[PDB]
Design a protein around this ligand. Structure first.
Ligand code: TPV
Lengths: 99, 99
């Protein structure tokens, strides 16, 4: 698809058989999801946004479908205003910025 | 321009006669720049992101050049860790996400 930016670029994702809404965010290095359970072990990560740093749980090799497109990679879980799909997964589904 | 997302989508902008580097961010509602002076009236605003909220100064009807493309709109100025071009100006240069 081609997504214009007049509205927030919110898509449906699927993770652990659950549908969720997520923001496609080209300013994010990483993908950050609201509190949920994921399989396997996690490792600690600190990430920075406009309001400062947050502590998140890093889960590697997580299956996630984004607007119909399969991706498998790192997902961080922590206090975030919205589920964010960052460049690590935007690259996997073939996403570019065009103007 | 077609921009891949392997790396941070950083572009050159021109604002108030100054050349600056800025992040194209499809997740930001608003454009927010690190501290600088801008002409005209401003009002205080609070904006949220990862890490919580920051206080910014809001300047309307500001002209910016983004990779050669002229855009006018609201520019916020405050303690952001990076210059961010958000959707309010990305729409004006006809920027889309494609996959
Ligand atoms: C996962 C980190 C995300 C990011 C990284 C910025 C960065 C880059 C390189 C180095 C250091 C830091 C990019 C980003 O889009 C935001 C948020 C949206 C998630 C953001 C950016 C710009 C402005 C706002 N505030 S706002 O009022 O314009 C706004 C508020 C809420 C939302 C919502 F959709 F997320 F809800 C979007 N925009 C928020 C942020 O806070 O940091």
């Amino acid at each position: 698809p081609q997504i214009t930016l007049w509205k927030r670029p919110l898509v449906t994702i699927k993770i652990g058989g659950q549908l969720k809404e997520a923001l496609l965010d080209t300013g994010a290095d990483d993908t950050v999801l609201e509190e949920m359970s994921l399989p396997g072990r996690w490792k600690p990560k600190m990430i920075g946004g406009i309001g400062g740093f947050i502590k998140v749980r890093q889960y590697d090799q997580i299956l996630i479908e984004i607007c119909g497109h399969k991706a498998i990679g790192t997902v961080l879980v922590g206090p975030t205003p919205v589920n964010i799909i960052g460049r690590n997964l935007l690259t996997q589904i073939g996403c570019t910025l065009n103007f």
